[PDB]
RNA sequence: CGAUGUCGGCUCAUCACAUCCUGGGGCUGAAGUAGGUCCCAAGGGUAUGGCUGUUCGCCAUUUAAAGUGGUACGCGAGCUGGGUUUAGAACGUCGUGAGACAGUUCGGUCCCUAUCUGCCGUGGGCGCUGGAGAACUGAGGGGGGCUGCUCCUAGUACGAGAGGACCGGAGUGGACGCAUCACUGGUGUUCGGGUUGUCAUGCCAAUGGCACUGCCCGGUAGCUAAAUGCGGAAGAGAUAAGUGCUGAAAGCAUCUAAGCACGAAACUUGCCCCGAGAUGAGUUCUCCCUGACUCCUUGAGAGUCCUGAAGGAACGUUGAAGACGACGACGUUGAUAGGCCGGGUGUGUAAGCGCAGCGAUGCGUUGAGCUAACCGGUACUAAUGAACCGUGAGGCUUAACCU
RNA sequence: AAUUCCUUGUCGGGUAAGUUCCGACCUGCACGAAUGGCGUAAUGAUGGCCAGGCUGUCUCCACCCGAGACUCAGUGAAAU
RNA sequence: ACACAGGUGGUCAGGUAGAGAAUACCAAGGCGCUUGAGAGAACUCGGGUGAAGGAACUAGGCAAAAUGGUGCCGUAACUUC
RNA sequence: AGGACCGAACCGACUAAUGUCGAAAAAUUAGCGGAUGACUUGUGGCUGGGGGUGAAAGGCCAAUCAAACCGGGAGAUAGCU
């Protein structure tokens, strides 16, 4: 359950350490993002050697949330940190070469199959 | 046509595919036809049913007479349904839950749970005003209710505080899941109105 | 707040129509002693349904 | 909106409400008959009648529980020694409500509550 | 009610092993990769146990690849295949939500061995 | 002017159409995609932030779109008081000065218990023509009406190509509404436990009081969203702008003058809710009452005795019903409350013993003890025999058809 | 700039975006030296701006606990 | 003006905890504040808790949340030292 | 040592909400500033109306202040209502 101003740790190794959600894309008045949704990000904290510098506006996919993901059985999968993977605005596709930590099944939808292959779990 | 049925809580049906579907358990006793209204007498073709039972003293003589003309036992209440031309029913006929075996979706009707007197926030989803920043005695109030001199009046159907619930409401096209004849049940996917032990009216979907 | 111009005897009366309080008209009689009392209440002497159950 | 809820608030806070029943149960056990307000009487049943069942099995833990509630060893002595064995055969329903009109100073509906014996 | 209680009791699997909170449990889960049907393991500490018959459930906490993952399982789901117990913790609480704040050495729990 | 509180915000809106999107169309400097313009169309929908008192505005990022206006530049007996407009103070400036400045700067009391109208709810009264209990019809209101992508059609038509569809179908979203508590949670001072200070129960041990529930930890039932089901429609009729057909006036032409068709989220229906106070008070179905006598202006009459029905109200026990009324259940031929019993659920191994230790403490009995609102039972209490209201065959004309 | 009208002056910083803020420039409408000029540590219920922490401020409100409101009895005003 | 949540000088100074005349619980002693009784709607007042988020609120973090003790370690620019 | 520090009494009155026919013609509640000093307070004195007093606000001088209150000139005068 990510929204404007929510700060996210970064799952991939793009360069960003922390980022901030500046918009939830895909509809008017749209409250929240989660699960495997696209969001607009500004980078609030980056590392020195990384591919993306601080204060860069680009897109991202939420891969983990504290509120979690409901499977159809009624069961839920929560996490200990909201987390995302950065994407290239217009081109899409992840910037980083590797992905840290697990990512849910509900991320599986063609365009993010690169994000699942690199991921160590689920 | 339709059947009258008590609401009996909720459960979930796990399918082996790997899905739990949340079901409302509606127990549907033998709905016995007390009277058949037709275009000769009434001006519309319809049937009047009953269900459950009542106590010998608690039923009045006007009802007890009415029930004695059909030959059926006095059921707890009376409901009526219209007839869809082709189908035609006889008096003293006990309609079972096997009517919903062939169908897929149903419009469950019921009297909703009485929330009592409700404020504009709860009733109409009015937005609470600022909880602080100077606000004086007016956090959950409705705010303005009209313009100024031009109307010089509140318009009709203005959303205000007042009675919420205890009103007839219809959830449309709920999917039927299991139709147990042995125990006299009807399992529908999702939540339907009223509380556990309330009277529902189940009837086939109108938007097929 | 505050009336624009005073109401009448009439209105005031109309309002008071529903203020008229109802009598009991339903006094019981105790089986043994034959004393009048409220239904489901004891008597002044201390009876309820033909049996003393109080000093 | 209080659907399916229990307990009367009786225009008090919890800690008070819990005390006034702790006293009023103690008063009912001692005198065996009480004049109170019809609601207070109806809500006293829920406090007292368990202390009577608690008192059927005389031991230690039950005496200590019956002392944790009530907080008076006299009442705990009248329970267990008398009211425990006196209601041995009877299953629940140890107390009786009888309405006794209206209070003078405030028109409150009064009621006598007493134990079902007083022989 | 009896009507519901009859519908629940037929659906409940009658072979769930007994596990307490603070037990290291390895839940096996049916997963589907479109056409496939795999069994995924999920080893972790049992943190909370809800008992409501058919509606019973339990939370398992697992400190995987850096960050922690909590997974609530619906006990009588067919998706849960098996619930094997590995360790039994000497804990004296029902819900172990205090473990969320802790990590590593503080997060570890004494074994029962009674 | 014996006072009509004036910017902006918040809350709540409502109408207009000169339409922002959505829908329907004509021409194009319209190949397709994407437009340009004009016509019809008001059903629904129509951002969140940064800066600033701002409305605007400029940005950032969205969105199908981020409409223009009216409503005392809607809305202070609804909120705010940042702005402007009291008293303090200072800067620049003008004045010899008091002071002054649509110049700036810091600080600076926003009262009202609702009589009427109105509105949202909820009742009493009588009426509807003998009374009573049901069930309805539905005149007439009222809600609802939003869209996105992705796939399929199809890399199809259209194009050297790059691009790339109409009509058609499908899935899954956003926003909004309705229901609901099965799941996920929140709450849960009425359930368990840990614990600090302290007082008390003669003392130990064990408890209770107070300290924001003392502070915490979990959590039942309810209530609830972030939770989960559902909704918007298809269809039908009459149509706008438009498209036509046949076709005179005007040997032709011509959508129009006769006639005949199509044609939109608008209109009337279809969906949902209310609704016979619809005084035009409507239908059915049932139920109940089949007595004597007096007086008069021989009246739709004042009466006397005698009867009291169906039903109702009251009273009680009460409820997922409720401010009070109301509404639903129930009153012994009884599960309506409470108790009790069994189960559950929660808490997490009570007390007392007995071991182990030098003591805190730890084992054992023991998943124990204690468990609100829960589930299934149980007449243990408490729901009374009764009294009270309500009657005694139901007006007058006419017309159909009964023996 | 407590002083600047034009004006949200330009440029730089901070921000995804900064009419405020900080630094700089000087075209000072209309600073300027005891009606003091410029500096500056410390101090301030001082004005402006930023950050961490934290939060029902808000997204977006939910539930609970008490005091009223509501019913019953007693007393019993007020503005107009 | 009221049996009015105001104002009014001095003196006395028990216990456990505490630096303490703070605060908590208490002793001596004193009182329960002169309308009650029900119910447990909206709404208001004073509180408690709150999923994910965390100033997005607003003129302004106003208001709430926070931080809070003792010992020891450790502590920047600048300074009138 | 200190118009030093933190903090109760005591003196104050920065913020907020409540209250605004109030509990109260200025208070309550929760925070807030000073708290060995240019401090605070009791008791009694002195200064008087164009006068006093004023770490200056036109503040204060008995709930009254850009000239107190009471009586008098006095039925001031009012081209105004
Ligand atoms: C005492 S200054 C009053 C200023 C005035 N207020 C209302 O009208 C303006 O106009
Ligand atoms: K033990
Ligand atoms: K004179
Ligand atoms: Mg930047
Ligand atoms: Mg007929
Ligand atoms: Mg019945
Ligand atoms: Mg209710
Ligand atoms: Mg409410
Ligand atoms: Mg609203
Ligand atoms: Mg708000
Ligand atoms: Mg204010
Ligand atoms: Mg106000
Ligand atoms: Mg105020
Ligand atoms: Mg409020
Ligand atoms: Mg008018
Ligand atoms: Mg007037
Ligand atoms: Mg009269
Ligand atoms: Mg009245
Ligand atoms: Mg009797
Ligand atoms: Mg109940
Ligand atoms: Mg209650
Ligand atoms: Mg009281
Ligand atoms: Mg009271
Ligand atoms: Mg009280
Ligand atoms: Mg307490
Ligand atoms: Mg009980
Ligand atoms: Mg027993
Ligand atoms: Mg005038
Ligand atoms: Mg006037
Ligand atoms: Mg006015
Ligand atoms: Mg305005
Ligand atoms: Mg605003
Ligand atoms: Mg607004
Ligand atoms: Mg509207
Ligand atoms: Mg309009
Ligand atoms: Mg135009
Ligand atoms: Mg247009
Ligand atoms: Mg367009
Ligand atoms: Mg479309
Ligand atoms: Mg179109
Ligand atoms: Mg179309
Ligand atoms: Mg078009
Ligand atoms: Mg074209
Ligand atoms: Mg045209
Ligand atoms: Mg038009
Ligand atoms: Mg409209
Ligand atoms: Mg219209
Ligand atoms: Mg329409
Ligand atoms: Mg509308
Ligand atoms: Mg708009
Ligand atoms: Mg906007
Ligand atoms: Mg822009
Ligand atoms: Mg406009
Ligand atoms: Mg005006
Ligand atoms: Mg205008
Ligand atoms: Mg205005
Ligand atoms: Mg305008
Ligand atoms: Mg106001
Ligand atoms: Mg206004
Ligand atoms: Mg107004
Ligand atoms: Mg107001
Ligand atoms: Mg102000
Ligand atoms: Mg202000
Ligand atoms: Mg101001
Ligand atoms: Mg100002
Ligand atoms: Mg001034
Ligand atoms: Mg001016
Ligand atoms: Mg100006
Ligand atoms: Mg300013
Ligand atoms: Mg100030
Ligand atoms: Mg104020
Ligand atoms: Mg009124
Ligand atoms: Mg009115
Ligand atoms: Mg109205
Ligand atoms: Mg009439
Ligand atoms: Mg009628
Ligand atoms: Mg008629
Ligand atoms: Mg109609
Ligand atoms: Mg009408
Ligand atoms: Mg409408
Ligand atoms: Mg669509
Ligand atoms: Mg293809
Ligand atoms: Mg293609
Ligand atoms: Mg189409
Ligand atoms: Mg709407
Ligand atoms: Mg919803
Ligand atoms: Mg339930
Ligand atoms: Mg439940
Ligand atoms: Mg639960
Ligand atoms: Mg308790
Ligand atoms: Mg407890
Ligand atoms: Mg102690
Ligand atoms: Mg002692
Ligand atoms: Mg001792
Ligand atoms: Mg002890
Ligand atoms: Mg112990
Ligand atoms: Mg104890
Ligand atoms: Mg005490
Ligand atoms: Mg005390
Ligand atoms: Mg607190
Ligand atoms: Mg606290
Ligand atoms: Mg804690
Ligand atoms: Mg909890
Ligand atoms: Mg929980
Ligand atoms: Mg449809
Ligand atoms: Mg259509
Ligand atoms: Mg057709
Ligand atoms: Mg047509
Ligand atoms: Mg036609
Ligand atoms: Mg044309
Ligand atoms: Mg022709
Ligand atoms: Mg010609
Ligand atoms: Mg011619
Ligand atoms: Mg032609
Ligand atoms: Mg043509
Ligand atoms: Mg549509
Ligand atoms: Mg109806
Ligand atoms: Mg008439
Ligand atoms: Mg009729
Ligand atoms: Mg008739
Ligand atoms: Mg008839
Ligand atoms: Mg006469
Ligand atoms: Mg009789
Ligand atoms: Mg009689
Ligand atoms: Mg009879
Ligand atoms: Mg009731
Ligand atoms: Mg009730
Ligand atoms: Mg009624
Ligand atoms: Mg009625
Ligand atoms: Mg009634
Ligand atoms: Mg009834
Ligand atoms: Mg009944
Ligand atoms: Mg009865
Ligand atoms: Mg009996
Ligand atoms: Mg039985
Ligand atoms: Mg019961
Ligand atoms: Mg019970
Ligand atoms: Mg029990
Ligand atoms: Mg047992
Ligand atoms: Mg058991
Ligand atoms: Mg039990
Ligand atoms: Mg258990
Ligand atoms: Mg043990
Ligand atoms: Mg214990
Ligand atoms: Mg030993
Ligand atoms: Mg064991
Ligand atoms: Mg064992
Ligand atoms: Mg066991
Ligand atoms: Mg056992
Ligand atoms: Mg037990
Ligand atoms: Mg128990
Ligand atoms: Mg039961
Ligand atoms: Mg028996
Ligand atoms: Mg029996
Ligand atoms: Mg017996
Ligand atoms: Mg009876
Ligand atoms: Mg006759
Ligand atoms: Mg006759
Ligand atoms: Mg007849
Ligand atoms: Mg006749
Ligand atoms: Mg400037
Ligand atoms: Mg300027
Ligand atoms: Mg710049
Ligand atoms: Mg920059
Ligand atoms: Mg900012
Ligand atoms: Mg700049
Ligand atoms: Mg500013
Ligand atoms: Mg700002
Ligand atoms: Mg500067
Ligand atoms: Mg110069
Ligand atoms: Mg100069
Ligand atoms: Mg000059
Ligand atoms: Mg100067
Ligand atoms: Mg100069
Ligand atoms: Mg000078
Ligand atoms: Mg000079
Ligand atoms: Mg100076
Ligand atoms: Mg300077
Ligand atoms: Mg300087
Ligand atoms: Mg400095
Ligand atoms: Mg100072
Ligand atoms: Mg200061
Ligand atoms: Mg400051
Ligand atoms: Mg600031
Ligand atoms: Mg901050
Ligand atoms: Mg809400
Ligand atoms: Mg409450
Ligand atoms: Mg009264
Ligand atoms: Mg008067
Ligand atoms: Mg008093
Ligand atoms: Mg006093
Ligand atoms: Mg005081
Ligand atoms: Mg200490
Ligand atoms: Mg103290
Ligand atoms: Mg008092
Ligand atoms: Mg209430
Ligand atoms: Mg309350
Ligand atoms: Mg509060
Ligand atoms: Mg509150
Ligand atoms: Mg607390
Ligand atoms: Mg809190
Ligand atoms: Mg929160
Ligand atoms: Mg919690
Ligand atoms: Mg949290
Ligand atoms: Mg944070
Ligand atoms: Mg902001
Ligand atoms: Mg804003
Ligand atoms: Mg600002
Ligand atoms: Mg500011
Ligand atoms: Mg802050
Ligand atoms: Mg603050
Ligand atoms: Mg708060
Ligand atoms: Mg907190
Ligand atoms: Mg605080
Ligand atoms: Mg905190
Ligand atoms: Mg804390
Ligand atoms: Mg702390
Ligand atoms: Mg420290
Ligand atoms: Mg530094
Ligand atoms: Mg400096
Ligand atoms: Mg000194
Ligand atoms: Mg000092
Ligand atoms: Mg210091
Ligand atoms: Mg301080
Ligand atoms: Mg003093
Ligand atoms: Mg003050
Ligand atoms: Mg003061
Ligand atoms: Mg402040
Ligand atoms: Mg407050
Ligand atoms: Mg007031
Ligand atoms: Mg008041
Ligand atoms: Mg204070
Ligand atoms: Mg503070
Ligand atoms: Mg302080
Ligand atoms: Mg200081
Ligand atoms: Mg003084
Ligand atoms: Mg003196
Ligand atoms: Mg003197
Ligand atoms: Mg003078
Ligand atoms: Mg003089
Ligand atoms: Mg003189
Ligand atoms: Mg002089
Ligand atoms: Mg002075
Ligand atoms: Mg001045
Ligand atoms: Mg004065
Ligand atoms: Mg003055
Ligand atoms: Mg003068
Ligand atoms: Mg003078
Ligand atoms: Mg004087
Ligand atoms: Mg004279
Ligand atoms: Mg005169």
Curated annotation (Swiss-Prot), chain B:
InterPro entries: Ribosomal_uL3, Ribosomal_uL3_bac/org-type, Ribosomal_uL3_CS, Transl_B-barrel_sf
Protein's gene: rplC
Top-level lineage group: Bacteria
Post-translational modification N5-methylglutamine, affected residues: 149
GO terms for MF: rRNA binding; structural constituent of ribosome
Protein name (Swiss-Prot/TrEMBL): Large ribosomal subunit protein uL3
Organism for this UniProt entry: Escherichia coli O45:K1 (strain S88 / ExPEC)
Post-translational modification: Methylated by PrmB.
Family annotation (PROSITE patterns): RIBOSOMAL_L3 (PS00474)
Species classification: Bacteria, Pseudomonadati, Pseudomonadota, Gammaproteobacteria, Enterobacterales
UniProtKB/Swiss-Prot annotation, chain C:
Protein origin, superkingdom: Bacteria
Disulfide bond entries: none
InterPro entries, alphabetized: Ribosomal_bL32 (IPR002677), Ribosomal_bL32_bact (IPR044957), Ribosomal_zn-bd (IPR011332)
Alphabetically ordered keywords of this record: Ribonucleoprotein, Ribosomal protein
One GO process term, biological-process aspect: translation
Record region (Disordered): 1-37
GO molecular function, one term: structural constituent of ribosome
GO cellular component: large ribosomal subunit
Family that this chain belongs to: Belongs to the bacterial ribosomal protein bL32 family.
Protein name: Large ribosomal subunit protein bL32
Swiss-Prot record, chain D:
GO BP annotations listed: translation
Name of the protein described by the UniProt record: Large ribosomal subunit protein bL17
One Pfam family recorded for the sequence: Ribosomal_L17
Molecular function, one GO term: structural constituent of ribosome
Subunit structure: Part of the 50S ribosomal subunit. Contacts protein L32.
Gene: rplQ
Classification via InterPro entries: Ribosomal_bL17 (IPR000456), Ribosomal_bL17_CS (IPR047859), Ribosomal_bL17_sf (IPR036373)
Keywords assigned: Ribonucleoprotein, Ribosomal protein
Ribonucleoprotein listed as a keyword: yes
Any one cellular-component term (Gene Ontology): cytosolic large ribosomal subunit
Similarity field: Belongs to the bacterial ribosomal protein bL17 family.
Transmembrane regions listed in the UniProt entry: none
From Swiss-Prot, chain E:
Entry superkingdom: Bacteria
Cross-referenced Pfam families: Ribosomal_L19
Cellular component terms (Gene Ontology): cytosolic large ribosomal subunit
GO molecular function: structural constituent of ribosome
UniProt keyword list: Ribonucleoprotein, Ribosomal protein
Parts forming coiled coils: none
Keyword Ribosomal protein found: yes
Single biological process term from Gene Ontology: translation
HAMAP family (UniProt xref): Ribosomal_bL19 (MF_00402)
Function recorded in the entry: This protein is located at the 30S-50S ribosomal subunit interface and may play a role in the structure and function of the aminoacyl-tRNA binding site.
PANTHER family: LARGE RIBOSOMAL SUBUNIT PROTEIN BL19M, RIBOSOMAL PROTEIN L19
Entry similarity comment: Belongs to the bacterial ribosomal protein bL19 family.
Name listed for the protein in its UniProt record: Large ribosomal subunit protein bL19
Species the sequence originates in: Escherichia coli O45:K1 (strain S88 / ExPEC)
């Amino acid at each position: 359950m990510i929204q404007e101003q929510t700060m996210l740790n970064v799952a991939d190794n793009s360069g960003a350490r922390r980022v901030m959600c500046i918009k939830v894309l895909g509809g008017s008045h749209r409250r929240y993002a989660g699960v495997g949704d696209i969001i607009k990000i500004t980078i609030k904290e980056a590392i020195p050697r990384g591919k993306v510098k601080k204060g860069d506006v680009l897109k991202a996919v939420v891969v983990r949330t504290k509120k979690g993901v409901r499977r159809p059985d009624g069961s839920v999968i929560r996490f200990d940190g909201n987390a995302c993977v950065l994407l290239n605005n217009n081109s899409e596709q992840p910037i980083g070469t590797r992905i840290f930590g697990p990512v849910t099944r509900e991320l599986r939808s063609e365009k993010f199959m690169k994000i699942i292959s690199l991921a160590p779990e689920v | 046509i339709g059947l009258v049925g008590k609401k009996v809580g909720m459960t979930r049906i796990f399918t082996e595919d790997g899905v739990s579907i949340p079901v409302t358990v509606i127990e549907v006793e033998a709905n016995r036809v007390t009277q058949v209204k037709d275009l000769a007498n009434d001006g519309y073709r319809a049937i009047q049913v009953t269900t459950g039972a009542k106590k010998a003293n608690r039923v009045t003589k006007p009802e007890a007479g009415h029930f004695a003309k059909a030959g059926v036992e006095a059921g707890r209440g009376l409901w009526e349904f219209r007839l869809a031309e082709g189908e035609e029913f006889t008096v003293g006929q006990s309609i079972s839950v096997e009517l919903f075996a062939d169908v897929k979706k149903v419009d469950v009707t019921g009297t909703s749970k009485g929330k009592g007197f409700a404020g504009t926030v709860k009733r109409w989803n009015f937005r609470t005003q600022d909880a602080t920043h100077g606000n004086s005695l007016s956090h959950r109030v409705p705010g303005s209710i009209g313009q100024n001199q031009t109307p010089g009046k509140v318009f009709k159907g203005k959303k205000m505080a007042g009675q919420m619930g205890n009103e007839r409401v219809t959830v449309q096209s709920l999917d039927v899941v299991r139709v147990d004849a042995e125990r006299n049940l009807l399992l529908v996917k999702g939540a339907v109105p009223g509380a556990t032990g309330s009277d529902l009216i189940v009837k086939p979907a109108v938007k097929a | 707040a505050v009336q624009q111009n005073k109401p009448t005897r009439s209105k005031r009366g109309m309002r008071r129509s529903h203020d008229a309080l109802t009598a009991v008209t339903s006094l019981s009689v105790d089986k043994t002693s034959g004393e009048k009392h409220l239904r489901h209440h004891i008597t002044a002497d201390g009876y309820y349904r033909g049996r003393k159950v109080i000093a | 909106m209080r659907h399916r809820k229990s307990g009367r608030q009786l225009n008090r806070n919890s800690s008070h409400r819990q005390a006034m029943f702790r006293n009023m149960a103690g008063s009912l056990v001692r005198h065996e008959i009480i004049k109170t307000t019809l609601p207070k009487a109806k809500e006293l049943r829920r406090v007292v009648e368990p202390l009577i069942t608690l008192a059927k099995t005389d031991s230690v833990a039950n005496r200590r529980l019956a002392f944790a509630r009530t907080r008076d060893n006299e009442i705990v002595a009248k329970l267990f020694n008398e009211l425990g064995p006196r209601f041995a055969s009877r299953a629940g329903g140890y107390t009786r409500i009888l309405k006794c009109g209206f209070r003078a100073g405030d028109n409150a509906p009064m009621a006598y509550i007493e134990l079902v014996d007083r022989s | 009610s009896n009507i519901i209680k009859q519908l629940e009791q037929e659906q409940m699997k009658q072979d769930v092993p007994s596990f307490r909170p603070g037990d290291t449990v390895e839940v096996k889960v049916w997963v589907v990769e479109g056409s496939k049907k795999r069994l995924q393991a999920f080893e972790g500490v049992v943190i909370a146990i809800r008992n409501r018959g058919l509606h019973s459930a339990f939370t398992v906490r697992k400190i995987s690849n850096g960050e922690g993952v909590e997974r609530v399982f619906q006990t009588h789901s067919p998706v849960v295949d098996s619930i094997s117990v590995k360790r039994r913790g000497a804990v004296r609480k029902a819900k172990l939500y205090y473990l969320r704040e802790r990590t590593g050495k503080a997060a570890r729990i004494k074994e029962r061995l009674n």
